[PDB]
Amino acid sequence: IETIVNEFETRAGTLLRYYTGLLERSKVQPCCFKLYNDPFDMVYVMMNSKLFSHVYIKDCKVRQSFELASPKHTEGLIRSIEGHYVGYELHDGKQLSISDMMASQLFEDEYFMYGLQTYASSNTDVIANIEMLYQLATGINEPVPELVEGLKLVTEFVQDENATQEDYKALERKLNDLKASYYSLSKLAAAL
Amino acid sequence: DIETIVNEFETRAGTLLRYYTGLLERSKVQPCCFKLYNDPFDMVYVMMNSKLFSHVYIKDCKVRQSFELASPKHTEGLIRSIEGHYVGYELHDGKQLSISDMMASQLFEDEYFMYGLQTYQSSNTDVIANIEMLYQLATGINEPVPELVEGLKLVTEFVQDENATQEDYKALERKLNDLKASYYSLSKL
Numbered sequence A: 001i002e003t004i005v006n007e008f009e010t011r012a013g014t015l016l017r018y019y020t021g022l023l024e025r026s027k028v029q030p031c032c033f034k035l036y037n038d039p040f041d042m043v044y045v046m047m048n049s050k051l052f053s054h055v056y057i058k059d060c061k062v063r064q065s066f067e068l069a070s071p072k073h074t075e076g077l078i079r080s081i082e083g084h085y086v087g088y089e090l091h092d093g094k095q096l097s098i099s100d101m102m103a104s105q106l107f108e109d110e111y112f113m114y115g116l117q118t119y120a121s122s123n124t125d126v127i128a129n130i131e132m133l134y135q136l137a138t139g140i141n142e143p144v145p146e147l148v149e150g151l152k153l154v155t156e157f158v159q160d161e162n163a164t165q166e167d168y169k170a171l172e173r174k175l176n177d178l179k180a181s182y183y184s185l186s187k188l189a190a191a192l
Numbered sequence B: 001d002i003e004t005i006v007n008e009f010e011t012r013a014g015t016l017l018r019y020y021t022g023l024l025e026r027s028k029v030q031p032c033c034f035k036l037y038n039d040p041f042d043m044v045y046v047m048m049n050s051k052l053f054s055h056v057y058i059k060d061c062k063v064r065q066s067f068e069l070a071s072p073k074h075t076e077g078l079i080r081s082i083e084g085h086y087v088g089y090e091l092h093d094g095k096q097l098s099i100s101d102m103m104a105s106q107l108f109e110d111e112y113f114m115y116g117l118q119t120y121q122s123s124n125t126d127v128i129a130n131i132e133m134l135y136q137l138a139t140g141i142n143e144p145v146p147e148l149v150e151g152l153k154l155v156t157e158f159v160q161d162e163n164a165t166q167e168d169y170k171a172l173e174r175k176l177n178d179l180k181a182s183y184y185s186l187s188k189l
């Protein structure tokens, strides 16, 4: 596990550069690295021309990583680069910084929740959702602990316990606790 | 034989990178050619042999000379134009310079660049390397002020020299120097 040093203002950028860098080499030989002082503490794997990532969980055996990029699909990485500077306009008018964009996907997606339940545009596919959370995460410098803990609990839950209804609802209260500190209640309230 | 693709990101540097790494596979087994819709710099773009080259459309002039924007281990030039689009460049005096001023400065405010154009082991920066940085910077500028479009088109057409003469250099220089004065709101002198 090479830890490599950041060469851009965004992790998404350093990741885009190595991804193309290592793309060829990766078809014959899996590469594997960390970024220095990654606030999200991800392990990155280049295998077979794809980039994968999972936040590191100590207790937990990881049997499941998440795709950051494929050859014809780098727009995830690129969009976190742009998004990191100017956030995101949703099609119904509004504007979200990359952190609120991620907080939204993590805490205000009932389709996502529903899919987590069921585990043990609007998507309902748990892995797709997480992958996209991962992509946002690579554009965010100094994330509030609730994005960090949020991404870790979701990525843990899916490393299967053949997870039970109990593990799901334990998770659904934890995320609510975090949705609670992340957003001021009185703001959730004016959003209906 | 020029496919046209439509801007997919706030910046051309961004779209360029998505396509570059998307077409890496085909470009070895085939050359590869295209254009961004409404590119203010009118670049024609070629992927060939795992690299991406560019040149500004001239075409009265036939182009012996094209310019490398990326290669598989060297995409940072383009990524940097994304960052510098939003936030510009931090100089050794703690000041912050925009991508436009940075392009301006490389094009108009650099005398090693000029002498090398006169001319057209090691040295500080070769002429083609200079113009490549200029092209790379260009892809990060949204609504480029005319002197930048002009300057880049000039210097580009110059370098397809056909053994261009002392006279042609001096034609270039006066114009660059005009464009300079307009760009900087120099009072003359």
Ligand SMILES: [Cl-]
Pocket (backbone or CB within 6 Å): A037, A038, A039, A140, A141, A142, A143
């Ligand atoms: Cl950070």
Ligand SMILES: [Cl-]
Pocket (backbone or CB within 6 Å): B038, B039, B040, B141, B142, B143, B144
């Ligand atoms: Cl434009």
